[PDB]
């Protein structure tokens, strides 16, 4: 759902979200995170 995504970042303890590989840890160009 929507709020689950938001609650996850607000309160780390009761976080209920599918674990995924962070974007920063994938095979992506160095310029992909440089604004």
């Amino acid at each position: 759902d929507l709020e689950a995504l938001f609650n996850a970042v607000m309160n780390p303890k009761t976080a209920n979200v599918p674990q995924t590989v962070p974007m920063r840890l994938r095979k992506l160009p160095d310029s992909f995170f440089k604004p």
């Binding site: 995504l5 938001f6 590989v21 962070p22 160095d30 604004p35």
Partner: protein, 202 residues
Amino acid sequence: IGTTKLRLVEFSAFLEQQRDPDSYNKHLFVHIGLESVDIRQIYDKFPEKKGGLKELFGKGPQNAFFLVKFWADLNCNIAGAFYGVTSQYESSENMTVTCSTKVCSFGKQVVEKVETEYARFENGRFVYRINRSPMCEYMINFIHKLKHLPEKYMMNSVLENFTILLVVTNRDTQETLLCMACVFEVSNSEHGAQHHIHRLVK
């Protein structure tokens, strides 16, 4: 962004606020108008069901597929508020174009907005223009909740799992002229909204 068959000229998401009947404030969230990206590294973030991104990249052409990273400008207040999106495509050949916008959460399609639009001859080219296309309510509600978030790093963590898929079809052929896979962060810059364009491969 674009091939020799269809070029993207303008993309814009905005909030328009009407003060009095003669005064309008417009704020742009993102606007349009580098190294390549392995499309396998991002399949999980977009729908892979019947007609998903894996399917479409096989279908071709591979030069027509793009990943756009947006740094969104969320620096605005929030009556008479209009949430919109403007887009424009230019071609050298006439067509009946179909535009697909999928709002996705954790790779799951949340809402599809589908639009059919015809060309108009302009300066020896064929222009397709969606003017002030309403943002669906999920999107308005989503923007609102990002704003209630105290910190502009919390926003980033949340946006990590939110993507937009934009696909332009030739309605007669069923050929893809443009695909844009959109990834999202909030702007840190004093210059406002920014973007990186990468083509997808592999």
